[PDB]
Amino acid sequence: SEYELPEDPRWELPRDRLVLGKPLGEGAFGQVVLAEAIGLDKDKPNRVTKVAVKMLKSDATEKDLSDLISEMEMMKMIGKHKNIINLLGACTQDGPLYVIVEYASKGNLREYLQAREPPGLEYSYNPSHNPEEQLSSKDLVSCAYQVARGMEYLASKKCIHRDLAARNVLVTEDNVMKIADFGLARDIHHIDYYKKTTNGRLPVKWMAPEALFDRIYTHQSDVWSFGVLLWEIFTLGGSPYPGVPVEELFKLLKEGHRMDKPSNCTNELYMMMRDCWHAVPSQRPTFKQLVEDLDRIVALTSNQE
């Protein structure tokens, strides 16, 4: 926002080393396009890497710029992990801001899930059936595990992803889960909780009771989001709280309203959803425990007697 942008030799990439390709999507906050960076590897400056570049539109606003800059600096602290879109570099000096991150060839989890066929056996009766390309219980469970494993990392780094949803989860060509779309994420180092503004820019159907009503964010608030994400994964792209408008959700939540167990979802996994949606944030599981439980669930689902 109208201020000098520092020079980071560590991540700065020569603007002439980035060959822009076609766009991968557009949003009111920015635009993402595919491309190729030359020599990201110092050991071999002649090696090309396929990357995704995050930039603003000609109609971008001041906020859109702060977000893009916030996402850059935030991805430097968090570090790198196999379950998150790692920062590869950026172009900050003399020209438009370009944030270079890993490329997910299979889109986000929402799209990814709605594109394939559900785990249920009944779908085999349909004329158009593709057994070779049909999601299974293990696949769904594994996705939740990988995202959990990812969030467990962010938490250890004292980082909060105030917006955890299927939309912000990409799938690589190897079907690997990678949490993405940082920007609203904030640091907790030296603090107990992050205070949000009166009206935030985060989906209400993914916000926790304490954050949505008391403007309080904690690693426990991200857990609540995770609970809603599980619902999506087991509904294969479903939309939280079906039929109920955002305006009426505020009241229901106070009365203790919660979503019902999705079809083709084991009670074992639904209890985890209700566990994450505990009224009291401290009473909710921790990403540390979730990875453990989800790990055991994967082991069982893999060997169901």
Curated annotation (Swiss-Prot):
Mutagenesis / variant outcome for changing W206R: In HH2; with cleft palate
Active site per database record: D163 (proton acceptor)
Effect after changing R10L: In HH2; some patients also carry GNRHR mutations
Annotated ranges, domain Protein kinase: 18-305
Compartment(s) of residence: Cell membrane; Nucleus; Cytoplasm, Cytosol; Cytoplasmic vesicle
Consequence of changing V204L: In a lung large cell carcinoma sample; somatic mutation
Domain commentary: The second and third Ig-like domains directly interact with fibroblast growth factors (FGF) and heparan sulfate proteoglycans. Isoforms lacking the first Ig-like domain have higher affinity for fibroblast growth factors (FGF) and heparan sulfate proteoglycans than isoforms with all three Ig-like domains.
Protein name: Fibroblast growth factor receptor 1
Residues of the full protein shown: 461 to 765 of 822
